[PDB]
Nucleic acid binder design. Structure first.
Ligand SMILES: [Mg+2]
Ligand SMILES: [Mg+2]
Ligand SMILES: [Mg+2]
Ligand SMILES: [Mg+2]
Ligand SMILES: [Mg+2]
Ligand SMILES: [Mg+2]
Lengths: 367, 367
DNA sequence: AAGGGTCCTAGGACCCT
DNA sequence: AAGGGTCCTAGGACCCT
């Protein structure tokens, strides 16, 4: 039953990429811009007040010397994201992606192979790589302690390999399930790693200050929980299961309540190739007429290219819109003759358009 | 591109099963009863006026000597259904199920292997098994004619095997795609087979009298088409694509219009093991109070048994209801500890019940 | 008061930058 | 005026007996 999981989280991902291809930006405070949004920034800029997901106005206020690069085309970030996952797949092939910069790996089978190859002499010599959460004391006779420490050594090899092979830095967290691995990897956020021994599981979850910090609990779920007087991890631990079921559902209630105890039995899933390809564009209630084709035609040309590179073929298309005030969408299957180019697709999408501040296209259901 | 497909359709399936396990019912007119509904009947009863899906009142009127057996528990029909599919899977493993009594098989690879094993001498000796649709003339030099005729010989071997091994009779239709195979298999409905040569494709589709007879066109679609003045296959062939798209959708319009020409490029899919297990019960606004557990508990006990036999494990449950006047449903995932029994499930379902003339349970999303 | 099946759709929730 | 991802839900359509 006992598992050793690792969670790898790159530091200021987009910014770290821009700082790589243009070393001239290192040491200088950097923000990565998407329209009016500074979506992330390096640490030279966080010190100066800039914060993730900050207005381009407020950010230049706290740092007028802030150098900004446009990060709207994710192509380069996506390509590097998959270079990271692919390298980790060398260690163990079961690698789950979370967004572009986070990866889960189940190290269990790999920890146990390393253990058989050791002797009674070197086992007492097993050491930790990186921080132990809560400065908790190690017990070389606790077999769970030994396995987690081996997990931290693997985690350090990955992080070094990532830097040696892709010049990227990041954090790692080693724990017994995915929830705790992710929560502990950020205890030392700047290019460091942390291992969570079981006896500190409760210190970790109770170190949080709002239930939203639990991966699995978002805006709607949080707000519903505070409309019930649930503001802390412990409030949710002790809240009535029944009342929780008959207010949020039997699936939401019974899993988030297990997350509040640090429990999470979900396996690390192999993300493999993507299940979808999409592109978005946003605009200040600009598209006011059907000549919004050009904006659509742009999105296809990049998707069609990305698909051709992927080699697989999609069988469903989707169009999304956002309307000046909540999103609406229409999809349909892809004609067969088309699957084996640009002109016909457009006319499908506009038929979808006419059935109905943002336009987006997606290719899903891939073979 | 050229395919040889076969469609196998058993004669009065439920009735033929009841006549097997009780030979005493053969020769006598038989209906299979589900509540007030005579869902099917043998041919000794169709002659006497009884019709598929007929009131138990009107049927006994046209035939008071009608012997009826209850067919509400489908267990036996389902078990025989899969004995049929499994036997056909011996011929070629790619077998698509349609309901309990119909099966599609792609005979293409099997037709071509048989052809290489022949000599120029026996090829002119190739003969048809069963009817040729529209008494059309065979051309032993048309390679498509030869392949379809080989398809009819395989179809005859299946039907014989089905009778020799399971004592079941049925019809087969051999054509170049799934739509036409299904349409031609019923031209001689009582334990016979028919092959459709390409030059008669249009005689077959135009032999239909309402667009509803096209597999793919149902109640809602038919009615929408008649609200537009489309009553015949040809009306739909000639109807405006645009008007069809902007009234039914780009997926519905552009495929049903291809079905009206006898075109259908969908492949024969391997149905394999089921994707769901469900049980239903109906009742004259009977369940009026929460003690409807007993009716639910019945459905679980049979599903739980069927699942245990299957060996796979489900990960989602669903509850369906119908309310005296349109169905409503609630589902959720299956707790993990449960997956590896009866008491806990009930309390999930009732929570689903309280969130909300028929009750039903389903196990889906199987591993 | 049938008793089952299949697959799709539009929208929702969650996770990142 | 971010720009992407994942998976689930309730209901719909279609096909049989
Ligand atoms: Mg991250
Ligand atoms: Mg990060
Ligand atoms: Mg959260
Ligand atoms: Mg049939
Ligand atoms: Mg039949
Ligand atoms: Mg039809």
């Amino acid at each position: 039953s006992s598992r050793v999981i690792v969670h790898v989280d790159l530091d200021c991902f987009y910014a770290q990429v821009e700082m790589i291809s243009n070393p001239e930006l290192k040491d200088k405070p950097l923000g990565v811009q998407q329209k009016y949004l500074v979506v992330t920034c390096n640490y030279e800029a966080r010190k100066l007040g800039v914060k993730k997901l900050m207005n381009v106005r407020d950010a230049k206020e706290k740092c007028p010397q802030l150098v900004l690069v446009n990060g709207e085309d994710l192509t380069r970030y996506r390509e590097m994201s998959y270079k990271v996952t692919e390298l980790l797949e060398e260690f163990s092939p079961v690698v789950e992606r979370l967004g572009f910069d986070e990866n889960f790996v189940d190290l269990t089978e790999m920890v146990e192979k390393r253990l058989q190859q050791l002797q009674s002499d070197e086992l007492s010599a097993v050491t930790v790589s990186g921080h132990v959460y809560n400065n908790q004391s190690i017990n070389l006779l606790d077999v769970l302690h030994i396995r987690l420490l081996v997990g931290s050594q693997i985690a350090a090899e990955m992080r070094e390999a990532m830097y040696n092979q892709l010049g990227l830095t990041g954090c790692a967290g080693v724990a017994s399930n995915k929830l705790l691995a992710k929560l502990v990897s950020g205890v030392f956020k700047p290019n460091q790693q942390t291992v969570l021994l079981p006896e500190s599981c409760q210190h970790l979850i109770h170190s949080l200050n709002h239930i939203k910090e639990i991966p699995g609990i978002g805006y709607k779920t949080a707000k519903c929980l505070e409309a019930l007087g649930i503001n802390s991890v412990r409030d949710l631990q002790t809240f009535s299961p029944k009342i929780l079921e008959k207010e949020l559902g039997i699936s939401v209630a019974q899993r988030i309540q297990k997350l509040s105890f640090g429990e999470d039995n979900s396996p690390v899933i192999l993300s493999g190739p993507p299940q979808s390809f999409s592109e978005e564009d946003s605009f200040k209630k600009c598209s006011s007429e059907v000549e919004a084709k050009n904006k659509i035609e742009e999105l296809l040309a990049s998707l069609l290219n990305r698909v051709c590179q992927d080699g697989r073929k999609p069988h469903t298309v989707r169009l999304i819109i956002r309307r000046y005030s909540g999103r609406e969408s229409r999809q349909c299957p892809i004609p067969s003759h088309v699957i084996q180019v640009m002109t016909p697709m457009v006319d499908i999408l506009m038929k979808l358009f006419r059935n109905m501040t943002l336009l987006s296209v997606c290719f899903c259901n891939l073979k």
